């Protein structure tokens, strides 16, 4: 998934 | 093109040290969590280490736990596993792959690195 | 902590036929199960995650299913690239685990 941004992942 | 380039392997003696690397091309490496994985000869896949995409968390398997050490350089796109201790059970192809969905599971793998642990 | 059992470890067949392979995990997993082929002197190679969702590319021949504690992975129609070894794993926690594989081979 590229279009996942890991600095915005409201689970974490 | 998406490859992982792995080096750093070889020969190394019980009881030694030893660092592989793990180069990415073709894609964003500071987005995604990383894992080595490694496989003896003749036999299955065991799950070694992963590293989170800005190496805040780090996780081991309990048989390397305190003797291997996984890391990151972003600015490279390269990963590194050091290797300390080392014993005949670590002899193996050391895969590292990348965790593209960030669920603990390897959508693209490099082609590996042999580690022979011998005198 | 987490055991993955495959059966059949050695699995003969023709091309042409349809094949299945079974991974049983000793505890409940729900559907975080992937499975990997691996080919000769190749690194092994993502086929499903979620038990049934097929990666781009992989043919649509491979399907999987299951839920919890068993799973099945399917080949409709062996196709002569289909001969190959074979992993599951389970994704439950960050320790992962893999099956001890099944190897495909020819029947003569």
């Known amino acids: 998934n590229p279009n996942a941004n890991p600095n915005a992942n409201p689970n974490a | 093109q998406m490859q992982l380039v792995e080096s750093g392997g070889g020969v190394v003696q019980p009881g030694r040290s030893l660092r592989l690397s793990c180069t990415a091309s073709?894609?964003?490496?500071?987005?995604?969590?990383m894992h080595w994985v490694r496989q003896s000869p003749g036999q299955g896949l065991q799950w070694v280490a992963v590293?989170?995409?800005?190496?805040?968390?780090?996780y081991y398997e309990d048989s390397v736990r305190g003797r291997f050490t996984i890391s990151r350089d972003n600015s490279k796109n390269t990963l590194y596993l050091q290797m300390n201790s080392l014993r005949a059970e670590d002899t193996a192809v050391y895969y590292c792959?990348?965790?593209?969905?960030?669920?603990?599971?390897?959508?693209?793998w490099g082609q590996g690195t042999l580690v022979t642990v011998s005198s | 902590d987490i055991q993955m059992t495959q059966s059949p470890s050695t699995l003969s067949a023709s091309v042409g036929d349809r094949v299945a392979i079974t991974c049983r995990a000793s505890?409940?997993?729900?559907?975080?199960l992937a499975w990997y082929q691996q080919q000769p002197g190749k690194a092994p190679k993502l086929l499903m995650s979620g038990a049934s969702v097929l990666e781009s590319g992989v043919p649509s021949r491979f399907s999987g299913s299951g839920s919890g504690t068993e799973f099945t992975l399917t080949i409709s129609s062996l196709q002569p690239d289909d001969f190959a070894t074979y992993y599951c794993?389970?994704?439950?926690?960050?320790?992962?685990?893999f099956g001890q594989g099944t190897k495909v081979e020819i029947k003569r």
């Open positions: 073709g894609f964003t490496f500071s987005t995604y969590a």
């Open positions: 792959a990348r965790d593209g969905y960030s669920s603990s599971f390897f959508d693209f």
């Open positions: 590293i989170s995409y800005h190496s805040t968390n780090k």
């Open positions: 794993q389970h994704y439950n926690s960050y320790f992962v685990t």
């Open positions: 505890q409940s997993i729900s559907r975080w």
